[PDB]
Amino acid sequence: KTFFGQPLGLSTLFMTEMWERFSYYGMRAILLYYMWFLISTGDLHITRATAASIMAIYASMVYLSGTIGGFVADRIIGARPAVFWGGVLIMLGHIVLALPFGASALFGSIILIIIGTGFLKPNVSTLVGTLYDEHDRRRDAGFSIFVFGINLGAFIAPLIVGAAQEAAGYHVAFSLAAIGMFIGLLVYYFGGKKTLDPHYLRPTDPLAPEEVKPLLVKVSLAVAGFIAIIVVMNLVGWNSLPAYINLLTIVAIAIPVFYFAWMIVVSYIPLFIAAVLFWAIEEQGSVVLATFAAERVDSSWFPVSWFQSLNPLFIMLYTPFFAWLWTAWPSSPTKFAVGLMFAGLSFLLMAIPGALYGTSGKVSPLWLVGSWALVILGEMLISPNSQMMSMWFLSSSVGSALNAQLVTLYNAKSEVAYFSYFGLGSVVLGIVLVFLS
Ligand SMILES: CCCCCCC/C=C/CCCCCC(=O)OC[C@@H](O)CO
Ligand SMILES: CCCCCCC/C=C\CCCCCC(=O)OC[C@H](O)CO
Ligand SMILES: CCCCCCC/C=C\CCCCCC(=O)OC[C@H](O)CO
Ligand SMILES: CCCCCCC/C=C\CCCCCC(=O)OC[C@H](O)CO
Ligand SMILES: CCCCCCC/C=C\CCCCCC(=O)OC[C@H](O)CO
Ligand SMILES: CCCCCCC/C=C\CCCCCC(=O)OC[C@H](O)CO
Ligand SMILES: CCCCCCC/C=C\CCCCCC(=O)OC[C@H](O)CO
Ligand SMILES: CCCCCCC/C=C\CCCCCC(=O)OC[C@H](O)CO
Ligand SMILES: CCCCCCC/C=C\CCCCCC(=O)OC[C@H](O)CO
Ligand SMILES: CCCCCCC/C=C\CCCCCC(=O)OC[C@H](O)CO
Ligand SMILES: CCCCCCC/C=C\CCCCCC(=O)OC[C@H](O)CO
Ligand SMILES: CCCCCCC/C=C\CCCCCC(=O)OC[C@H](O)CO
Ligand SMILES: CCCCCCC/C=C\CCCCCC(=O)OC[C@H](O)CO
Ligand SMILES: NC(=O)CC[C@H](N)C(=O)O
């Protein structure tokens, strides 16, 4: 009695993540349009460009939080409590948007989810690994099934939440996200006590006595430095929302710079950059492509948010092939290059409808279908150890930090140039990074 060849525990963690991803990507699929709505009612006094920037820096902070989430669980509170309380915080974040409020609830929701996802996401991934011995070949297959589940939740969420939004409004749809996380907590809590090892109720690598003080010092100085900067910003009149997003952008990008300066490994640099650039493009699906979907495609007969299901749809379709592919077959730097090339191609493709049909009309949904087909093909060359997982979340974070700057450039007037430039740039950088490495 297994779960697709794996210990029954995989099913628990599988569904936990699926429902977490459900709530996250359900919310993500309507959050931009929601902000558009708040803007249209004079409730939110920002440009659409800034709204787009918010989406990206939101994702960036979510991934940055995940970069330290593993650390907190492994050394302070434990992997199993981190997932649980992480889940609770996420649930609360969605509940906040379900409440009959407007723009004033946005920040609180974002904070809870950043902290919550930071606690949950790296650590459920950790718990998957705990289901096996250090020497078991199923480890790869098991984690592959796990990722299939992550995308299963990401697939159905925009369909369900998107349609719900169109039926009963935004707050009801957001509450469905909350309910989804609640389901995940149920399956995780009761299922976990039966499948998961109890040694992960506590930190497996607790802070040694002499480690606590210098850690505390470094956190204090960092937080103090950050706050001092914000003070200065408010004194000199740089306190607009983009100002804060720029601050966050700089912080997120500075982190690998000083983190890589620390070990300087120089072979890791092009790998990191390729990942950063790939995730930048991939994460623009929920922002730039979401915008294209709403403005440049006729979605008069279906929720336009449904386009967000295409990304994880292709993960699920490619998984059977690529599984067989690896059984029946490329260097790590090669995989990243070709992957980034596909990402670039996915944007070059998106440049065609505007150049061929103009930008003032509407084009076939198949353009976005083909685009996601291309970038997810690239993800297959990138997508599937506490330390490496951290670099993974970090690369994702920097990509979205970059997006926070980049997506503000996107509009109907700049559409073709935007997709062409960053599309061809990514293809070229793909070529450069494969030979540089
Ligand atoms: C088939 C799956 C293989 C994965 C890679 C495929 C990527 C290829 C994408 C090209 C398709 C995009 C073109 C869509 C298109 O032009 O249709 C527009 C319109 O004519 C349809 O009515
Ligand atoms: C894991 C470390 C993260 C450190 C930063 C903590 C979170 C800081 C900012 C959250 C990023 C969201 C900025 C956009 C935003 O707040 O929008 C608010 C609404 O527009 C209300 O006007
Ligand atoms: C366990 C360590 C981290 C603790 C996480 C606590 C998160 C800190 C602040 C989140 C702010 C949540 C309150 C915001 C809120 O409720 O929305 C505002 C009103 O509902 C809108 O009128
Ligand atoms: C302890 C688990 C909590 C999970 C339940 C979260 C959702 C709970 C109740 C649903 C709240 C739905 C709000 C409905 C609402 O805001 O009115 C709808 C619009 O304002 C007008 O159509
Ligand atoms: C306003 C929402 C607040 C909800 C608080 C509910 C708290 C109820 C019980 C606390 C249980 C916390 C421990 C759960 C945990 O560590 O997960 C491990 C479980 O053994 C299953 O893996
Ligand atoms: C607003 C954030 C400012 C930065 C937070 C800095 C302070 C955060 C946590 C302080 C933790 C208390 C240090 C003492 C300690 O952890 O010992 C507890 C051990 O478990 C004792 O056995
Ligand atoms: C550990 C729980 C408390 C930690 C979170 C408290 C708030 C933390 C940082 C505040 C946000 C810092 C970046 C500024 C920012 O996001 O802008 C927010 C919007 O400008 C709101 O108007
Ligand atoms: C150990 C990593 C820490 C590195 C932190 C580096 C932060 C250095 C400078 C941050 C300056 C904040 C930028 C503020 C800003 O861009 O405001 C400009 C606004 O766009 C004007 O409206
Ligand atoms: C080796 C020492 C050098 C430290 C490297 C830190 C990296 C600093 C900045 C990264 C560039 C991203 C800034 C983009 C940005 O936020 O634009 C805002 C402008 O600063 C003002 O409009
Ligand atoms: C596994 C089978 C389910 C496949 C359908 C998944 C649908 C998910 C998102 C749909 C997003 C909008 C795509 C619309 C579409 O493909 O129609 C294309 C028509 O040829 C339009 O002329
Ligand atoms: C393997 C399939 C990949 C398909 C993508 C390859 C597409 C190749 C080039 C697309 C770039 C077309 C841009 C056309 C263009 O820039 O028009 C300029 C006009 O002046 C519009 O402002
Ligand atoms: C695994 C490598 C992926 C290679 C992609 C294979 C497809 C190659 C080129 C497809 C280019 C699609 C351009 C769309 C196009 O030109 O048609 C325009 C519209 O159909 C007008 O009716
Ligand atoms: C990569 C070698 C290490 C040196 C890093 C120093 C510069 C760090 C990051 C460079 C990318 C900065 C992205 C910000 C950017 O492109 O701004 C775009 C505009 O601000 C859009 O408004
Ligand atoms: N970029 C990442 O690190 C994670 C993205 C992936 N789509 C997920 O939700 O798990």
Residue numbers in the entry: 6 to 269, 282 to 346, 351 to 405, 420 to 472
Which sentences from the paper describe this structure?
Proton-dependent oligopeptide transporters (POTs; also known by the acronyms PepTs and PTRs) are ubiquitous in bacteria and eukaryotes where they play an important role in nitrogen acquisition through proton-coupled uptake of di- and tripeptides (Daniel et al., 2006, Smith et al., 2013). POTs belong to the major facilitator superfamily (MFS), and therefore adopt a canonical MFS fold where two 6-helical MFS domains, the N domain and the C domain, cradle a centrally located substrate binding cavity (Quistgaard et al., 2016, Yan, 2015). The MFS fold enables substrate transport through an alternating access mechanism, which involves conformational transitions between inward open, outward open, and occluded states (Newstead, 2015, Quistgaard et al., 2016, Yan, 2015). Twenty-eight peptides were screened for binding to PepTSt from Streptococcus thermophilus, and structures were determined of PepTSt in complex with four physicochemically diverse dipeptides, which bind with millimolar affinity: Ala-Leu, Phe-Ala, Ala-Gln, and Asp-Glu.
Furthermore, Ala-Gln was also found to bind well, implying that a glutamine residue can be accommodated in the second position. The structures of PepTSt were determined in complex with four dipeptides that collectively represent substantial sequence variation: Ala-Leu, Phe-Ala, Ala-Gln, and Asp-Glu. These peptides, furthermore, bind with a rather wide range of affinities: high in the case of Ala-Leu (0.56 mM), intermediate for Ala-Gln (6.82 mM) and Phe-Ala (10.95 mM), and rather weak for Asp-Glu (>50 mM). The structures were refined to maximum resolutions of 2.7–2.2 Å, and were either in the inward open conformation (PepTSt[Phe-Ala], PepTSt[Asp-Glu]) or in an inward-facing partially occluded form (PepTSt[Ala-Leu], PepTSt[Ala-Gln]), which mainly differs from the former by exhibiting pronounced bending of transmembrane helices 10 and 11 (TM10 and TM11) (Lyons et al., 2014, Quistgaard et al., 2017). An overlay of the structures reveals that the peptide backbones of Ala-Phe, Ala-Leu, Ala-Gln, and Asp-Glu overlap strongly with each other, while Phe-Ala adopts a markedly different position. The backbone interactions of Ala-Leu, Ala-Gln, and Asp-Glu are similar to those previously described for Ala-Phe (Lyons et al., 2014): The N-terminal residue interacts with Asn-156, Glu-299, Asn-328, and Glu-400, while the C-terminal residue interacts with Arg-26, Tyr-30, and Lys-126. Ala-Gln binds in much the same position as Ala-Leu. Yet the glutamine side chain is bound quite differently than leucine: Tyr-68 and to a lesser extent Trp-296 have moved closer to it, thus narrowing the pocket around it and enabling the formation of van der Waals interactions as well as a putative N-H···π bond mediated by Trp-296. In addition, Trp-427 and Ser-431 have undergone rotameric shifts in order to form hydrogen bonds to the side-chain amide.
